[PDB]
Amino acid sequence: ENYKGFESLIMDFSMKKNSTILVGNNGCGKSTILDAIQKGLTHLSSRLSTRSHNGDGIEKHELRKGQN
Amino acid sequence: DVSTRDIENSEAQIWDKFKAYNKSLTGKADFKLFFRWFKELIEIETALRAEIRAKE
Amino acid sequence: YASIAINYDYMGIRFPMIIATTEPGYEDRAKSNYSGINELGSIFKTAHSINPNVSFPLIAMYTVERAN
RNA sequence: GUUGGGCGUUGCGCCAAACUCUAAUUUAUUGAUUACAU
DNA sequence: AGCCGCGGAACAAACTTTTTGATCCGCAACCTACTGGATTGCGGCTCAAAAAGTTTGTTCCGCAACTGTAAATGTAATC
Numbered sequence: 001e002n003y004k005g006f007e008s009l010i011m012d013f014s015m016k017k018n019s020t021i022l023v024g025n026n027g028c029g030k031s032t033i034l035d036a037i038q039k040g041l042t043h044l045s046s047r048l049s050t051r052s053h054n055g056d057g058i059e060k061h062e063l064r065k066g067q068n
Numbered sequence: 069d070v071s072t073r074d075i076e077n078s079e080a081q082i083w084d085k086f087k088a089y090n091k092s093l094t095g096k097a098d099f100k101l102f103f104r105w106f107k108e109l110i111e112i113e114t115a116l117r118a119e120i121r122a123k124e
Numbered sequence: 125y126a127s128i129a130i131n132y133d134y135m136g137i138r139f140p141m142i143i144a145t146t147e148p149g150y151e152d153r154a155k156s157n158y159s160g161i162n163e164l165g166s167i168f169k170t171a172h173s174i175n176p177n178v179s180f181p182l183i184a185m186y187t188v189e190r191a192n
Numbered sequence: 193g194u195u196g197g198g199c200g201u202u203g204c205g206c207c208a209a210a211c212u213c214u215a216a217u218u219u220a221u222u223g224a225u226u227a228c229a230u
Numbered sequence: 231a232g233c234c235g236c237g238g239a240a241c242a243a244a245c246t247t248t249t250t251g252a253t254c255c256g257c258a259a260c261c262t263a264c265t266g267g268a269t270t271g272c273g274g275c276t277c278a279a280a281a282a283g284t285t286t287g288t289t290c291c292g293c294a295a296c297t298g299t300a301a302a303t304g305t306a307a308t309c
C-alpha cells in the first residue's frame with residue numbers, strides 16, 4: 001500500500017507449486033515486490049537468529065510521491 | 069550504475085578535449101563524471117547558500 | 125549461558141551490573157541488567173552540569189604490552 | 193480448486209451431484225443466543 | 231501506553247591496493263667498418279601521485295511484555 005510504485009497490490013503465491021515467476025516491462029515494479037518481500041525477510045531472519053529484534057524499514061525516499 | 073555514492077559526493081577544470089579519453093576504456097559508465105559535467109555546465113549562468121549555512 | 129555480575133560501589137549505595145551473553149535457544153537462563161551503572165553515569169553527568177570542574181574517577185587497565 | 197445430498201466395516205470412507213467478480217471460517221473466568229440441572 | 235540491551239547502519243577519517251603520465255636505459259639501429267660523431271629513436275621497467283576501495287571507531291536510530299488493592303465458574307460459538 002503506497003509503496004514505491006504500487007498503490008494497492010494483493011497477490012497470493014501458490015503452495016502446491018514451488019516456483020513463481022514475475023514478468024513485466026522495465027518500469028512496472030517486479031523489483032518492488034521483491035524489495036517488499038525483503039525488509040520483512042530481514043526481520044524474520046533477525047528474530048530467528050539474533051536477539052537484536054531489529055531490521056529494515058520503509059525509508060523516506062521509498063514513499064509514494066504525494067502520499068504520507 | 070547510478071547510486072547515492074556519486075550524487076551525494078558532488079560537494080574548476082575547463083573540460084578540455086584531451087579529457088574525455090580519461091577513464092573511458094575501463095568498463096563502467098561513470099555517472100559521477102557526467103554529474104560533475106552537468107553541474108559545471110549549468111553553474112555558468114551565494115547569499116542564499118550562506119543563509120543555508122547559518123540556519124543549519 | 126555466561127554471566128559476569130561485578131558490583132561497584134561509591135562510598136555508599138551499591139551500584140550493580142550484570143553482563144550476560146547466551147546462545148540463541150537457551151535465552152531465559154541469563155540476561156543483562158545495566159540499571160545501576162546507567163544511574164551512576166547519570167549522576168556524574170548531572171554533577172558535570174552543576175559543577176563544571178567536578179572530580180571524576182580513574183579507570184584503566186594495563187596488559188603485558190606496556191613495554192613490549 | 194470450493195458447496196450442498198445419500199449409504200454405512202461412521203471422532204469419516206465411498207457414491208451421487210453442482211459453482212467459478214483475478215481473490216476461504218478461530219476469544220474466555222465477557223457480553224448476546226440454543227439447550228439440560230434448577 | 232511507556233521504551234532494555236543488541237546489533238546493523240549511516241557516515242567518516244585512516245590504511246591500502248591500482249589506476250594514470252613521465253623518465254630512464256638497454257638495445258638494437260645507423261654509419262660504415264665497428265665507440266661515426268658533433269647521432270638519434272623505440273620498447274620493457276620503474277617512479278611516486280592521486281583518483282578509487284576497504285577498514286575501522288563513533289553516533290543514533292527500533293523493538294517486548296506487561297505492569298501496585300486485582301475470579302476456580304458444568305456444554306457449544308461468536309468478537
Ligand SMILES: Nc1ncnc2c1ncn2[C@@H]1O[C@H](COP(=O)(O)OP(=O)(O)O)[C@@H](O)[C@H]1O
Pocket residue numbers: 003004005025026027028029030031032033061062063064065
Ligand atoms: N517516490 C516515487 N514516486 C513515484 N514513483 C516511484 C517512486 N518510487 C518508486 N517509484 C516507481 O517505482 C518504479 C521502479 O521499478 P522497479 O521497482 O525497479 O521494477 P523493475 O526493475 O522490474 O523495472 C519506477 O517505475 C518508479 O516510477
